[PDB]
Nucleic acid binder design. Structure first.
Ligand SMILES: [Ca+2]
Ligand SMILES: [Ca+2]
Ligand SMILES: [Ca+2]
Ligand SMILES: [Ca+2]
Ligand SMILES: [Ca+2]
Length: 307
DNA sequence: TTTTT
Protein backbone atom coordinates (compact mmCIF):
# COMPACT_ATOMS: atom_id res chain seq x y z
CA UNK A 1 0.00 0.00 0.00
CA UNK A 2 1.13 3.48 -1.06
CA UNK A 3 -0.07 6.05 1.48
CA UNK A 4 -0.03 8.78 -1.14
CA UNK A 5 -1.94 6.67 -3.68
CA UNK A 6 -4.60 5.83 -1.06
CA UNK A 7 -5.03 9.42 0.11
CA UNK A 8 -5.59 10.34 -3.55
CA UNK A 9 -8.13 7.57 -4.16
CA UNK A 10 -9.95 8.39 -0.93
CA UNK A 11 -10.17 12.01 -2.11
CA UNK A 12 -11.50 10.93 -5.51
CA UNK A 13 -14.10 8.81 -3.72
CA UNK A 14 -15.21 11.59 -1.36
CA UNK A 15 -15.80 13.77 -4.46
CA UNK A 16 -17.69 11.17 -6.54
CA UNK A 17 -21.46 11.66 -6.87
CA UNK A 18 -23.22 10.27 -3.81
CA UNK A 19 -19.82 9.54 -2.21
CA UNK A 20 -18.07 6.32 -3.26
CA UNK A 21 -18.43 4.67 0.14
CA UNK A 22 -17.23 1.39 -1.34
CA UNK A 23 -13.74 2.52 -2.32
CA UNK A 24 -13.29 4.16 1.09
CA UNK A 25 -14.13 0.93 2.94
CA UNK A 26 -11.93 -1.21 0.65
CA UNK A 27 -8.89 0.91 1.41
CA UNK A 28 -9.26 1.86 5.06
CA UNK A 29 -10.44 -1.45 6.50
CA UNK A 30 -7.57 -3.22 4.71
CA UNK A 31 -4.71 -1.21 6.19
CA UNK A 32 -2.91 -1.34 9.52
CA UNK A 33 -3.39 1.42 12.04
CA UNK A 34 -0.02 2.91 11.07
CA UNK A 35 -0.95 2.91 7.38
CA UNK A 36 -4.23 4.66 8.24
CA UNK A 37 -2.28 7.42 10.01
CA UNK A 38 -0.04 7.70 6.93
CA UNK A 39 -3.10 8.02 4.69
CA UNK A 40 -4.55 10.58 7.07
CA UNK A 41 -1.39 12.70 6.92
CA UNK A 42 -1.02 12.38 3.14
CA UNK A 43 -4.67 13.41 2.76
CA UNK A 44 -4.06 16.44 4.97
CA UNK A 45 -1.13 17.47 2.73
CA UNK A 46 -3.00 17.13 -0.56
CA UNK A 47 -6.09 18.96 0.76
CA UNK A 48 -5.17 21.07 3.82
CA UNK A 49 -8.23 19.44 5.41
CA UNK A 50 -8.33 16.70 8.04
CA UNK A 51 -9.25 13.26 6.73
CA UNK A 52 -11.29 12.52 9.84
CA UNK A 53 -13.40 15.65 9.39
CA UNK A 54 -13.93 15.13 5.64
CA UNK A 55 -15.19 11.59 6.28
CA UNK A 56 -17.61 12.68 9.02
CA UNK A 57 -19.26 15.03 6.50
CA UNK A 58 -19.20 12.42 3.69
CA UNK A 59 -20.55 9.38 5.59
CA UNK A 60 -23.44 8.70 7.94
CA UNK A 61 -24.87 6.03 10.21
CA UNK A 62 -23.01 2.96 11.37
CA UNK A 63 -20.49 3.27 8.53
CA UNK A 64 -19.37 6.65 9.89
CA UNK A 65 -18.92 5.26 13.41
CA UNK A 66 -16.69 2.44 12.14
CA UNK A 67 -14.50 4.59 9.91
CA UNK A 68 -13.91 7.45 12.35
CA UNK A 69 -12.88 4.95 15.00
CA UNK A 70 -10.48 3.35 12.51
CA UNK A 71 -8.86 6.73 11.89
CA UNK A 72 -7.78 6.90 15.56
CA UNK A 73 -4.67 5.33 17.09
CA UNK A 74 -5.31 2.43 19.48
CA UNK A 75 -4.85 4.51 22.63
CA UNK A 76 -6.98 7.35 21.17
CA UNK A 77 -9.87 5.10 20.21
CA UNK A 78 -10.01 3.41 23.62
CA UNK A 79 -9.61 6.76 25.33
CA UNK A 80 -12.47 8.23 23.31
CA UNK A 81 -14.66 5.20 24.07
CA UNK A 82 -13.99 5.60 27.79
CA UNK A 83 -15.10 9.25 27.60
CA UNK A 84 -18.18 8.38 25.55
CA UNK A 85 -19.15 5.85 28.24
CA UNK A 86 -18.75 8.35 31.12
CA UNK A 87 -20.38 11.30 29.35
CA UNK A 88 -23.50 13.09 30.41
CA UNK A 89 -25.16 12.39 33.74
CA UNK A 90 -25.34 8.60 33.50
CA UNK A 91 -22.50 6.13 33.01
CA UNK A 92 -22.29 3.22 30.56
CA UNK A 93 -20.78 0.81 33.08
CA UNK A 94 -20.73 -2.12 30.64
CA UNK A 95 -18.56 -0.28 28.11
CA UNK A 96 -16.35 0.98 30.93
CA UNK A 97 -16.05 -2.55 32.29
CA UNK A 98 -15.19 -4.04 28.88
CA UNK A 99 -12.41 -1.59 28.08
CA UNK A 100 -10.80 -1.53 31.51
CA UNK A 101 -11.06 -5.25 32.22
CA UNK A 102 -9.63 -6.27 28.84
CA UNK A 103 -6.66 -3.94 28.38
CA UNK A 104 -3.12 -4.91 29.32
CA UNK A 105 -0.71 -2.89 31.48
CA UNK A 106 1.00 -1.38 28.44
CA UNK A 107 -2.33 -0.52 26.82
CA UNK A 108 -3.63 1.09 30.05
CA UNK A 109 -0.61 3.31 30.65
CA UNK A 110 -0.78 4.75 27.13
CA UNK A 111 -4.56 5.20 27.41
CA UNK A 112 -3.96 7.03 30.71
CA UNK A 113 -1.35 9.17 28.93
CA UNK A 114 -3.41 9.92 25.83
CA UNK A 115 -6.67 10.46 27.77
CA UNK A 116 -4.99 13.33 29.63
CA UNK A 117 -3.84 14.88 26.33
CA UNK A 118 -7.24 14.71 24.61
CA UNK A 119 -9.62 15.66 27.43
CA UNK A 120 -7.35 17.74 29.71
CA UNK A 121 -8.34 15.79 32.82
CA UNK A 122 -7.00 12.51 34.17
CA UNK A 123 -8.83 9.26 33.42
CA UNK A 124 -8.74 8.40 37.12
CA UNK A 125 -10.51 11.58 38.17
CA UNK A 126 -13.14 11.08 35.48
CA UNK A 127 -13.71 7.53 36.74
CA UNK A 128 -13.96 8.62 40.39
CA UNK A 129 -16.62 11.22 39.43
CA UNK A 130 -18.96 8.75 37.69
CA UNK A 131 -18.74 5.57 39.79
CA UNK A 132 -19.24 4.92 43.50
CA UNK A 133 -18.55 2.29 46.11
CA UNK A 134 -16.55 -0.88 45.67
CA UNK A 135 -17.18 -0.68 41.91
CA UNK A 136 -15.15 2.53 41.94
CA UNK A 137 -12.44 0.87 44.03
CA UNK A 138 -12.17 -1.93 41.47
CA UNK A 139 -12.27 0.30 38.39
CA UNK A 140 -9.69 2.68 39.88
CA UNK A 141 -7.32 -0.17 40.73
CA UNK A 142 -7.65 -1.77 37.30
CA UNK A 143 -7.12 1.47 35.37
CA UNK A 144 -3.68 2.07 36.90
CA UNK A 145 -2.28 -0.65 34.65
CA UNK A 146 0.20 -1.62 37.37
CA UNK A 147 -0.64 -5.31 37.91
CA UNK A 148 2.42 -7.44 38.66
CA UNK A 149 4.10 -8.97 35.62
CA UNK A 150 4.69 -12.69 35.33
CA UNK A 151 7.70 -13.92 37.27
CA UNK A 152 10.10 -16.62 36.07
CA UNK A 153 9.38 -19.08 38.93
CA UNK A 154 5.76 -20.03 39.57
CA UNK A 155 4.78 -19.11 43.13
CA UNK A 156 2.80 -22.17 44.13
CA UNK A 157 2.70 -21.21 47.83
CA UNK A 158 1.03 -17.86 47.08
CA UNK A 159 -1.29 -19.47 44.55
CA UNK A 160 -2.62 -21.57 47.44
CA UNK A 161 -2.79 -18.65 49.89
CA UNK A 162 -4.61 -16.44 47.37
CA UNK A 163 -7.12 -19.23 46.65
CA UNK A 164 -7.68 -19.76 50.38
CA UNK A 165 -8.01 -15.98 50.83
CA UNK A 166 -10.59 -15.57 48.06
CA UNK A 167 -12.57 -18.27 49.87
CA UNK A 168 -12.30 -16.98 53.45
CA UNK A 169 -13.34 -13.59 52.07
CA UNK A 170 -16.43 -14.79 50.28
CA UNK A 171 -18.34 -18.03 50.09
CA UNK A 172 -16.91 -19.23 53.43
CA UNK A 173 -17.83 -16.27 55.65
CA UNK A 174 -21.07 -14.32 56.09
CA UNK A 175 -20.91 -11.10 54.07
CA UNK A 176 -18.00 -10.31 51.74
CA UNK A 177 -14.51 -8.86 52.24
CA UNK A 178 -14.67 -7.15 48.85
CA UNK A 179 -11.29 -5.33 49.20
CA UNK A 180 -9.60 -8.71 49.62
CA UNK A 181 -11.08 -9.64 46.23
CA UNK A 182 -10.01 -6.34 44.66
CA UNK A 183 -6.47 -6.71 46.00
CA UNK A 184 -5.80 -10.25 44.83
CA UNK A 185 -7.47 -9.75 41.45
CA UNK A 186 -6.06 -6.36 40.46
CA UNK A 187 -2.54 -6.96 41.76
CA UNK A 188 -1.55 -10.51 40.87
CA UNK A 189 -0.28 -11.49 37.43
CA UNK A 190 -2.71 -12.94 34.87
CA UNK A 191 -0.90 -16.32 34.65
CA UNK A 192 -0.83 -16.46 38.46
CA UNK A 193 -4.57 -15.75 38.81
CA UNK A 194 -5.33 -18.38 36.19
CA UNK A 195 -3.72 -20.83 38.60
CA UNK A 196 -5.40 -19.32 41.66
CA UNK A 197 -8.80 -19.77 40.00
CA UNK A 198 -8.16 -23.46 39.47
CA UNK A 199 -6.76 -23.94 42.97
CA UNK A 200 -9.81 -22.11 44.28
CA UNK A 201 -11.96 -24.88 42.85
CA UNK A 202 -10.12 -27.16 45.28
CA UNK A 203 -11.57 -25.34 48.32
CA UNK A 204 -14.90 -24.01 47.15
CA UNK A 205 -17.95 -25.99 45.94
CA UNK A 206 -18.45 -23.12 43.44
CA UNK A 207 -16.04 -21.92 40.77
CA UNK A 208 -14.94 -18.27 40.46
CA UNK A 209 -17.94 -17.17 38.34
CA UNK A 210 -20.58 -18.95 40.43
CA UNK A 211 -19.05 -17.42 43.55
CA UNK A 212 -19.14 -13.89 42.10
CA UNK A 213 -22.82 -14.32 41.17
CA UNK A 214 -23.58 -15.56 44.70
CA UNK A 215 -21.64 -12.85 46.58
CA UNK A 216 -22.05 -9.40 44.93
CA UNK A 217 -24.63 -7.84 42.61
CA UNK A 218 -25.04 -5.11 40.03
CA UNK A 219 -22.05 -3.26 38.62
CA UNK A 220 -19.62 -4.91 41.02
CA UNK A 221 -20.90 -8.34 39.96
CA UNK A 222 -20.57 -7.44 36.30
CA UNK A 223 -17.13 -5.92 36.80
CA UNK A 224 -15.88 -9.13 38.48
CA UNK A 225 -17.48 -11.52 35.96
CA UNK A 226 -15.99 -9.75 32.94
CA UNK A 227 -12.66 -9.56 34.77
CA UNK A 228 -12.49 -13.30 35.50
CA UNK A 229 -13.28 -14.07 31.87
CA UNK A 230 -10.55 -11.73 30.68
CA UNK A 231 -8.04 -13.37 33.05
CA UNK A 232 -9.09 -16.89 32.04
CA UNK A 233 -9.39 -16.61 28.22
CA UNK A 234 -9.46 -13.11 26.69
CA UNK A 235 -10.31 -14.13 23.07
CA UNK A 236 -13.17 -16.26 24.38
CA UNK A 237 -14.45 -13.22 26.27
CA UNK A 238 -14.53 -11.12 23.10
CA UNK A 239 -16.16 -13.97 21.16
CA UNK A 240 -18.88 -14.29 23.81
CA UNK A 241 -19.43 -10.53 23.74
CA UNK A 242 -19.49 -10.49 19.93
CA UNK A 243 -22.10 -13.27 20.04
CA UNK A 244 -24.25 -11.41 22.62
CA UNK A 245 -24.21 -8.29 20.47
CA UNK A 246 -25.89 -10.17 17.61
CA UNK A 247 -27.73 -13.26 18.88
CA UNK A 248 -31.26 -11.87 19.22
CA UNK A 249 -33.41 -8.93 18.10
CA UNK A 250 -31.32 -6.33 16.32
CA UNK A 251 -27.70 -5.49 17.12
CA UNK A 252 -25.82 -3.64 19.85
CA UNK A 253 -23.81 -2.02 17.09
CA UNK A 254 -21.80 -0.01 19.61
CA UNK A 255 -20.28 -3.16 21.11
CA UNK A 256 -19.87 -4.89 17.71
CA UNK A 257 -18.09 -1.89 16.17
CA UNK A 258 -15.83 -1.44 19.20
CA UNK A 259 -14.62 -5.05 19.41
CA UNK A 260 -14.09 -5.37 15.64
CA UNK A 261 -12.23 -2.05 15.50
CA UNK A 262 -10.10 -2.46 18.60
CA UNK A 263 -9.36 -6.19 18.22
CA UNK A 264 -8.71 -6.36 14.45
CA UNK A 265 -4.88 -6.13 14.64
CA UNK A 266 -4.55 -7.56 18.15
CA UNK A 267 -6.13 -11.00 18.45
CA UNK A 268 -8.88 -11.24 15.81
CA UNK A 269 -7.65 -14.65 14.65
CA UNK A 270 -7.80 -16.04 18.18
CA UNK A 271 -11.30 -14.55 18.69
CA UNK A 272 -12.42 -16.14 15.40
CA UNK A 273 -11.13 -19.57 16.47
CA UNK A 274 -12.95 -19.44 19.79
CA UNK A 275 -16.15 -18.15 18.21
CA UNK A 276 -16.09 -20.91 15.58
CA UNK A 277 -15.26 -23.69 18.06
CA UNK A 278 -18.02 -22.64 20.49
CA UNK A 279 -20.84 -21.59 18.15
CA UNK A 280 -20.25 -23.89 15.17
CA UNK A 281 -20.38 -21.15 12.56
CA UNK A 282 -17.92 -18.37 11.90
CA UNK A 283 -17.83 -14.88 13.36
CA UNK A 284 -17.96 -13.84 9.71
CA UNK A 285 -21.29 -15.64 9.34
CA UNK A 286 -23.03 -13.91 12.24
CA UNK A 287 -21.85 -10.52 10.98
CA UNK A 288 -23.16 -11.26 7.49
CA UNK A 289 -26.58 -12.23 8.87
CA UNK A 290 -26.92 -9.29 11.22
CA UNK A 291 -25.82 -6.28 9.13
CA UNK A 292 -26.27 -4.89 5.61
CA UNK A 293 -24.55 -2.69 3.07
CA UNK A 294 -21.22 -0.88 3.25
CA UNK A 295 -21.47 -1.24 7.02
CA UNK A 296 -21.45 -5.04 6.66
CA UNK A 297 -18.57 -5.06 4.17
CA UNK A 298 -16.65 -2.88 6.62
CA UNK A 299 -17.11 -5.22 9.61
CA UNK A 300 -16.32 -8.21 7.38
CA UNK A 301 -12.94 -6.84 6.25
CA UNK A 302 -12.10 -6.14 9.87
CA UNK A 303 -13.03 -9.75 10.59
CA UNK A 304 -10.47 -10.75 7.99
CA UNK A 305 -12.19 -13.72 6.38
CA UNK A 306 -14.74 -16.53 6.68
CA UNK A 307 -14.00 -19.57 8.85
C1' DT B 1 -16.64 19.75 16.46
C1' DT B 2 -16.33 18.22 21.09
C1' DT B 3 -16.16 18.89 25.48
C1' DT B 4 -19.20 21.29 29.69
C1' DT B 5 -23.69 22.41 32.70
CA1 LIG C 1 -22.55 12.93 8.34
CA1 LIG D 1 -21.61 10.21 33.24
CA1 LIG E 1 -22.09 -14.42 51.68
CA1 LIG F 1 -26.98 -12.04 42.26
CA1 LIG G 1 -29.42 -9.93 15.66
Amino acid sequence: SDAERDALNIETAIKTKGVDEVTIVNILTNRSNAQRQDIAFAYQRRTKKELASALKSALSGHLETVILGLLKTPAQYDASELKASMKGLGTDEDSLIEIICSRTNQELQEINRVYKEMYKTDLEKDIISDTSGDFRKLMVALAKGRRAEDGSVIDYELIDQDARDLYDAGVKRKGTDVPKWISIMTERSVPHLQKVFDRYKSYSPYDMLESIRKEVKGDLENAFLNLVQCIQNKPLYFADRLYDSMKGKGTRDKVLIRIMASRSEVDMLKIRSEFKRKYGKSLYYYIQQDTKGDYQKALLYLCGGDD
